From a paper:
A key step in the assembly pathway of double-stranded DNA viruses, including bacteriophage and evolutionarily related herpesviruses, is the packaging of viral genomic DNA into the procapsid. During this process, the large terminase protein docks onto the portal protein, which is embedded in the capsid wall, and translocates DNA using free energy liberated from ATP hydrolysis.
Spherical capsids with thick serrated walls were present alongside larger, faceted capsids with thinner walls in lysates of [name]-45–infected T. thermophilus cells. Empty and DNA-filled expanded capsids appeared to be of the same size, with the diameter of the circumsphere at ∼82 nm, compared with ∼66 nm for the procapsid. Single-particle reconstructions imposing icosahedral symmetry were calculated at 4.4-Å resolution for the procapsid and 3.7-Å resolution for the expanded capsid. All residues for the expanded capsid could be modeled, whereas the procapsid model contains all residues except for 23 N-terminal and 12 C-terminal amino acids, for which there is no clearly defined density, suggesting flexibility or disorder. Segments of residues 24 to 45, 62 to 76, 93 to 105, and 126 to 136 were modeled as poly-Alanine due to lack of interpretable side-chain density. In the procapsid, the E loop has a relaxed conformation, with its middle section being partially disordered but with its end locked in a G-loop/E-loop “trap”, whereby the tip of the E loop is pinned beneath the G loop of a neighboring subunit. Other significant differences between the expanded and procapsid states are in the N-terminal and C segments of the capsid protein, residues 1 to 23 and 398 to 409, which engage in subunit interactions in the expanded state but are disordered in the procapsid. The packaging activity of procapsids was low at 50 °C, with minimal activity observed at 20 °C.
Numbering used by the authors:
A (entry chain A): 24 to 397
B (entry chain F): 60 to 117
C (entry chain B): 235 to 397
The structure:
């Protein structure tokens, strides 16, 4: 029954087409890249534009041309020291339960085996894709990758801390937004706050908040903000002394995202899925409250790199596979008989082109603003 | 067939996400917890109710 | 008018532009509001200006990087420049002095970007270098020959605070 490795590859290509048919924000920001190397250069360097422009030289006649300072290239002379974190696992089936399920099927052994194997393949691909998502998200929400020994996806307890060195991924806040002062009032306008971010980025071309990202519920914090309430009241045209007595809450809940999107002008792309840990909880990739925000531009950023494979090289010389590797195993001839399969590869998300004139690089930052959510 | 299985089964989503494993170099793979199809092992007890009828004329 | 940077806030602080938006969008500060927010004015400033005065407001910031690493724009913050004859190509940029050998014969020089390299790998530092450069000047479009003056474009200053 459990056979057909070439058909397993075909059905795996079908499952990958089904997985990559839909796409996500976090998937959109990083393409899939594959290298035969393993040096794991943590960031590329790419900063040469009219923001780094400079202007040319006067000279009078009769002399040699005074040379061009190219100190960005000499500053770019450095090395990249980081190590690729693999991720790999394998699902196994005991022959006892496969003859249990073969007698349970009893109409097509290889067909129900094909269905069950392809189901487990799709689920394990989902585990792979969520590993990739947790990598990319764990760096972009905190600037760096940290592995404590107590991850539900770290049973071994292997720890790693690999940093990339974004300057300030956090943002200043004197307090959260929805603190209540006076009788009942917002502490601060968020829209006027992001106006202050643009006001600070008056000079600076890469502080200006371009497009914001927040997945779960945050709208209600806006709906409680009496500044945003006042925007909605002036927008739709109600004085609480004269035109209305008290507006209701789902007005604010309806209009807050759009009035924010119009008045601040940065896009609010809301894209959360969930990750299901071992502990039974269901959390979103974004945690509730806080929100990351791009403030240079909007486009791709970084790179998800496939670190090269360790495999049987060839009969002679060395060469390796470079994509999603796939192979089957039997241990049914053995003292515990078990049928197992393995596909999960070595990889790393890389950051974008670092700035080259200085070493600083901050394109995305975040702030925490919700001391009570649920 | 007429066995009348009381429930179908289909559940594989991002609320059933899972992820890969932090494994070190050069060791054996820590394998997959197989709780899904093991907990799925059950038998259904239901029976079809056939609905049949026939008019007649005097 | 041509002006690059954020001056829309400087528009929004002008209370006549405020009262423009107040009556135009239909809000009395005595009756229909106590005070409107600042950022409706921010959203409305360039549009209320363009529909009211009726001249094309082409707003264009360009990132100007000088030697000491700070960032500016070509137009400085605040003020403006303004055309007042027509919209159309004023001026011209002239590239002169196509320098080479003068020649073995007569001067019939080329007119475009010529570039050449200079290797010096034989020398006391053995170095490699490239040259390019343009002897040039922007030539303004001259007046109609009646007067001596030519004023197609002027400006004024108001940014008594930069920030």
């Amino acid at each position: 029954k459990f056979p057909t490795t070439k058909e397993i590859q075909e059905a795996v290509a079908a499952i990958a087409d089904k997985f990559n048919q839909e796409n996500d924000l976090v998937d959109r920001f990083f393409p899939e890249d594959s290298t035969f190397a393993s040096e794991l250069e943590l960031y590329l360097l790419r900063t040469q534009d009219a923001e780094q422009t400079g202007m040319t030289f006067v000279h009078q006649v009769g002399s040699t041309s005074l040379p061009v300072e190219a100190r960005v290239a000499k500053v770019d002379l450095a090395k990249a020291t980081w190590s690729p974190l693999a991720f790999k696992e394998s699902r196994v089936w005991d022959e006892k339960e496969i003859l249990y399920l073969g007698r349970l099927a009893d109409e097509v052994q290889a067909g129900v085996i094909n269905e069950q194997i392809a189901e487990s393949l799709t689920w394990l691909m989902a585990r792979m894709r969520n590993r990739r998502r947790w990598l990319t998200w764990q760096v972009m929400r905190t600037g760096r990758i940290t592995i404590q020994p107590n991850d539900p996806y770290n049973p071994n307890g292997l720890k790693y801390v690999i940093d990339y060195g974004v300057t300030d991924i956090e943002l200043p806040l004197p307090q959260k937004f929805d603190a209540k002062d006076g009788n009942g009032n917002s502490a601060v306008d968020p829209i006027q706050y992001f106006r202050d971010l643009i006001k600070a980025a008056t000079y600076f071309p890469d502080r200006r908040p371009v497009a914001i990202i927040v997945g779960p519920g945050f709208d209600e914090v806006l709906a409680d903000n009496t500044f945003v309430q006042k925007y909605v009241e002036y927008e739709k045209g109600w004085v609480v002394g004269q035109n209305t007595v008290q507006p209701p809450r789902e007005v604010y809940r309806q209009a807050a995202l759009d009035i924010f999107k119009r008045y601040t002008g940065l896009e609010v792309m809301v894209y959360d899925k969930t990750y299901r840990d071992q502990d039974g909880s269901v959390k979103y990739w974004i945690p509730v409250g806080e929100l990351i925000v791009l403030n240079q531009s909007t486009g791709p950023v970084g790179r998800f790199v496939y670190t090269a494979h360790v495999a049987g090289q060839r009969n002679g010389k060395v060469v390796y596979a470079t994509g999603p590797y796939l192979t089957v195993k039997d241990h049914l001839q053995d003292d515990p008989p078990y049928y197992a399969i393995i596909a999960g590869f070595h990889g790393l998300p890389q950051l974008s082109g670092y700035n080259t004139e200085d070493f600083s690089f901050h394109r995305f930052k975040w702030l925490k603003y919700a001391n009570n959510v649920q």
